[PDB]
Amino acid sequence: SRVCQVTGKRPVTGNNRSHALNATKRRFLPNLHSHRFWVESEKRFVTLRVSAKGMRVIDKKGIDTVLAELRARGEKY
Amino acid sequence: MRHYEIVFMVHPDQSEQVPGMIERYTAAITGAEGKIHRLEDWGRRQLAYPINKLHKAHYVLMNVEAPQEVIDELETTFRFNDAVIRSMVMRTKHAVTEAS
Amino acid sequence: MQVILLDKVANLGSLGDQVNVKAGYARNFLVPQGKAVPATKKNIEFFEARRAELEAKLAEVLAAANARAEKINALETVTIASKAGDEGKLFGSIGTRDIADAVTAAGVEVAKSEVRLPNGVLRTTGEHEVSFQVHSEVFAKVIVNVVAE
Amino acid sequence: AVVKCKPTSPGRRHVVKVVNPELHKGKPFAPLLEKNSKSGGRNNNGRITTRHIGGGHKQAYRIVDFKRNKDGIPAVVERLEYDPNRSANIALVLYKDGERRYILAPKGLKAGDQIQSGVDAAIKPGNTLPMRNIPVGSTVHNVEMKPGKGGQLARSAGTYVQIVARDGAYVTLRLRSGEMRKVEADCRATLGEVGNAEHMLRVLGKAGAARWRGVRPTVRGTAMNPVDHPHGGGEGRNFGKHPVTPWGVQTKGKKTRSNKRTDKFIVRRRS
RNA sequence: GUUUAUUAAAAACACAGCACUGUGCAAACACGAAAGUGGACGUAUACGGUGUGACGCCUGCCCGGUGCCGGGAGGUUAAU
Numbered sequence A: 001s002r003v004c005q006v007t008g009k010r011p012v013t014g015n016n017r018s019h020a021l022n023a024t025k026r027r028f029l030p031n032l033h034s035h036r037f038w039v040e041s042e043k044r045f046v047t048l049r050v051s052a053k054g055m056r057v058i059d060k061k062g063i064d065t066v067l068a069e070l071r072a073r074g075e076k077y
Numbered sequence B: 001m002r003h004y005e006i007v008f009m010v011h012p013d014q015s016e017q018v019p020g021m022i023e024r025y026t027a028a029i030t031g032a033e034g035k036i037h038r039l040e041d042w043g044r045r046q047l048a049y050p051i052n053k054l055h056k057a058h059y060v061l062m063n064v065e066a067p068q069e070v071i072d073e074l075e076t077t078f079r080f081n082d083a084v085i086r087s088m089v090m091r092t093k094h095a096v097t098e099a100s
Numbered sequence C: 001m002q003v004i005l006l007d008k009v010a011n012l013g014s015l016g017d018q019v020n021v022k023a024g025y026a027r028n029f030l031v032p033q034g035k036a037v038p039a040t041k042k043n044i045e046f047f048e049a050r051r052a053e054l055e056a057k058l059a060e061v062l063a064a065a066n067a068r069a070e071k072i073n074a075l076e077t078v079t080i081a082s083k084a085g086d087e088g089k090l091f092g093s094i095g096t097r098d099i100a101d102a103v104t105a106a107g108v109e110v111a112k113s114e115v116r117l118p119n120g121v122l123r124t125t126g127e128h129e130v131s132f133q134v135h136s137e138v139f140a141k142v143i144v145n146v147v148a149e
Numbered sequence D: 001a002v003v004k005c006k007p008t009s010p011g012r013r014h015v016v017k018v019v020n021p022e023l024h025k026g027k028p029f030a031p032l033l034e035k036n037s038k039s040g041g042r043n044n045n046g047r048i049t050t051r052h053i054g055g056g057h058k059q060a061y062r063i064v065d066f067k068r069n070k071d072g073i074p075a076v077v078e079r080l081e082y083d084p085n086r087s088a089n090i091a092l093v094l095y096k097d098g099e100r101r102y103i104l105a106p107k108g109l110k111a112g113d114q115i116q117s118g119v120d121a122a123i124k125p126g127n128t129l130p131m132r133n134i135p136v137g138s139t140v141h142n143v144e145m146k147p148g149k150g151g152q153l154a155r156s157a158g159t160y161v162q163i164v165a166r167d168g169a170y171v172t173l174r175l176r177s178g179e180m181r182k183v184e185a186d187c188r189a190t191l192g193e194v195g196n197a198e199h200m201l202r203v204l205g206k207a208g209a210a211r212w213r214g215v216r217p218t219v220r221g222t223a224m225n226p227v228d229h230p231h232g233g234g235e236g237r238n239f240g241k242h243p244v245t246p247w248g249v250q251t252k253g254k255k256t257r258s259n260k261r262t263d264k265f266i267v268r269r270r271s
Numbered sequence E: 001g002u003u004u005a006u007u008a009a010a011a012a013c014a015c016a017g018c019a020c021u022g023u024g025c026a027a028a029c030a031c032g033a034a035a036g037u038g039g040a041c042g043u044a045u046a047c048g049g050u051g052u053g054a055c056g057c058c059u060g061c062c063c064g065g066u067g068c069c070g071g072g073a074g075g076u077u078a079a080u
């Protein structure tokens, strides 16, 4: 489903408010993109469905650090 | 048997392969029991007007005595050869051997 | 994105700079290839303090034996087989694949992706001035001839 | 080939048949057949996604070689066969190695003619070459859109494609719709037009003839109630509306193409 | 031929034919939150939509209104 594998971001629900303040249900979807990440340690590419924020997290930390957290959570990659 | 006069002009970049073209066609006519009468090779001549944005086309003239089917397959070869520009086949009603 | 380089980069590299590249440039090209690593303080000392010379020597002793082409002309102007008809007109074209294997001993010596074809794949009988990029600044200029056998 | 039926009964008065005496009378080549079950225009969800589909005669599927990738080996046509799946006729060809295949039958093709594919093939009809060895101006059909894809353009009866230009890696094609389109020059095409050009001259003559082609009746939107169609309602032949599809989209001229992915290949749209 | 099972069988619907229009194929379009599926194992002599409705002779004028198509100079104009 539309879940970021790194940050856990998933579709949240909110309202569309019009100028007349009419409320209709809507979903806020994460900015998800499949991306092949180069794992320097393992000499391979790992594809992850990540949000754009998830990509920024992977740049800030390491890819190995994020993979370790993914392995800890049981998230298979 | 019918007498034909074949003039075909060649791109002036394949002109060094013109002799390869010549003996291929003559073998076709002779192989089909024809006979070449003239085989003048005029070389690199100025065109009177640009053909396919060219000049210096390489003219080859040959008077042959072949049956119809050989001539059409020869014309077909000229048609599908992009090194040949503006072939021209004509009946001559007589074998022609005198120089041009 | 701040990144510390590991080799010579054409327009921003001096093998040790901390240039600010776009994230896509580092993430998709610079890092997956052996060219740069992220400029975390962990790496900066772990780059500068101990390898500021050994990867310099490794790159220099690797640029050597790469700048040593020894294949500027392998044997002669190499002649390659192909199937074609009359009037030149290569039926089966010659590409980076065929050039590499034929120029070497069945392709073992040299890889396939370092062959540069300014005229694209070869489509006519004749000799052509193909390049060969063995290393980031290496231009081998073998003349390859193709014959219709 | 085109025969008018005599008016021995209504439903026969206007029938015009396309009779081809060279079509093989008998059964198709069994090894090249497979089941082709009807859908009635229903999809995965079992819902009608295409209207006016259902019924008609049962049809077996003929495995037609669109790829034409048996290069160098000559083939001889043995039969012209009727194909219920396409408007074109198909030809059973026997290769020298003993393999039989179905191909689209070009216009001038009959039993005994020789065909082959590959870069070295001749320019006679029925031959398949990449559109790099085919001369510019030639009339081709069964045109590949990607190298090795198989051939998707100019397959209907009587259709063909004109090679208009060749700018190196690409070739410009005039499609039967009048559209100019770029196609990679390594894509393959079969020389000549598709046969059975008189296919468009047939007249079904009666409602039943369309019914047994798997075509169910079309109800005009204006004949419906407002709840069924945007057209519909009124006390006797009222329209007063801009013509639209059953889903409200304007018909009678409104571009529905929106790709942005293949526009780089379209030199000029049809007109 | 079809139709208001159970007050309407018809001039209604359909129809073969005709025309317009969309669609170059990962087609348009439709069903699907999506995957996917139908279209179609089809490829513009095809497919969808719309109107008309065998056939014969024909189908005139109006683009002001509304719609659609094309253009983009200029005016106005969102987030930023």
Ligand SMILES: [Mg+2]
Pocket: D051, D052, D218
């Ligand atoms: Mg329909």
Ligand SMILES: [Mg+2]
Pocket: D218
């Ligand atoms: Mg209709």
Ligand SMILES: [Mg+2]
Pocket: D218, D219, D220
């Ligand atoms: Mg109707």
Ligand SMILES: [Mg+2]
Pocket: D223, D224, D225
């Ligand atoms: Mg009603």
Ligand SMILES: [Mg+2]
Pocket: D226, D229, D230
């Ligand atoms: Mg409504």
Ligand SMILES: [Mg+2]
Pocket: D221, D222, D223, D231, D232, D233, D234, D237, D238, D239
């Ligand atoms: Mg109405």
Ligand SMILES: [Mg+2]
Pocket: D222, D223, D232, D233, D234, D235, D236, D237, D238
């Ligand atoms: Mg009404």
Ligand SMILES: [Mg+2]
Pocket: D235, D236, D237
């Ligand atoms: Mg009224």
Ligand SMILES: [Mg+2]
Pocket: none
């Ligand atoms: Mg019923």
Ligand SMILES: [Mg+2]
Pocket: none
């Ligand atoms: Mg009833």
Ligand SMILES: [Mg+2]
Pocket: E004
């Ligand atoms: Mg009743």
Ligand SMILES: [Mg+2]
Pocket: E007, E008
């Ligand atoms: Mg009643």
Ligand SMILES: [Mg+2]
Pocket: none
């Ligand atoms: Mg009744």
Ligand SMILES: [Mg+2]
Pocket: D223, E012
């Ligand atoms: Mg009614």
Ligand SMILES: [Mg+2]
Pocket: E003, E012, E013
């Ligand atoms: Mg009714």
Ligand SMILES: [Mg+2]
Pocket: E052
């Ligand atoms: Mg009506």
